Design a protein around this ligand. Sequence first.
Ligand SMILES: C[C@H](NCc1ccc(C(=N)N)cc1O)C(=O)O
Ligand SMILES: C[C@H](NCc1ccc(C(=N)N)cc1O)C(=O)O
Ligand SMILES: [Ca+2]
Ligand SMILES: [Fe+3]
Length: 223
Amino acid sequence: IVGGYTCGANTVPYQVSLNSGYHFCGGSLINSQWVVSAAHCYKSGIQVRLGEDNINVVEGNEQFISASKSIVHPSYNSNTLNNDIMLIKLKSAASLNSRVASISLPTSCASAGTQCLISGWGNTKSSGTSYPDVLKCLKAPILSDSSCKSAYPGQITSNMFCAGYLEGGKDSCQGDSGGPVVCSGKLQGIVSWGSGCAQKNKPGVYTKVCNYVSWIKQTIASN
Ligand SMILES: C[C@H](NCc1ccc(C(=N)N)cc1O)C(=O)O
Ligand SMILES: C[C@H](NCc1ccc(C(=N)N)cc1O)C(=O)O
Ligand SMILES: [Ca+2]
Ligand SMILES: [Fe+3]
């Protein structure tokens, strides 16, 4: 996260870190046994780390659980990033408490102007590389479809939305991928892509979760 602030230990209880010997993507806990992340975050040997703040130190409250299976959306296109969503089933159910909790799925899509919270352990620099130890936070508004499409001509599908600031300086970044975009207590987006990080006129692009609620429920119900 670029231009954000330190969230504070366990203030974002649904945030998870996907780990394979190092943090490589974020994710969101939606129930005791399932996590939602981005399809481009797929890889074998994923360990889900819940209740984390400092990802380099065991401070307590952490729960490390192996992924039993990862389900990338069948229509995911790695070239366009359309349908960039993936479900991860935990080998064992997580112990839910004040520090580890699930986030609700949306019942309706969010409108432009809606303020949301984006979080992650991704790069904090727009021009360079600097990964944080603790979780970073950023409040960003969902942009209008017209502004989003004008920023990324012919690259925005109905399953994506832009959020952030056109002036630059504040944005999600590499390492934040798969992480949550929560608005009014509901998971509305997943950190997907963008052009560089925090660049002017190049807001972040996110997977529009409200379009996948039925798919998520039907998939979880059959697995
Ligand atoms: C999909 C992945 N990119 C991820 C990615 C994530 C966040 C942003 C951003 N500035 N908000 C830009 C990105 O390009 C990749 O290019 O491999
Ligand atoms: C900045 C660089 N991402 C580059 C990038 C380029 C094109 C697309 C796309 N819409 N097909 C997505 C991306 O995430 C990166 O994440 O390193
Ligand atoms: Ca830790
Ligand atoms: Fe990218």
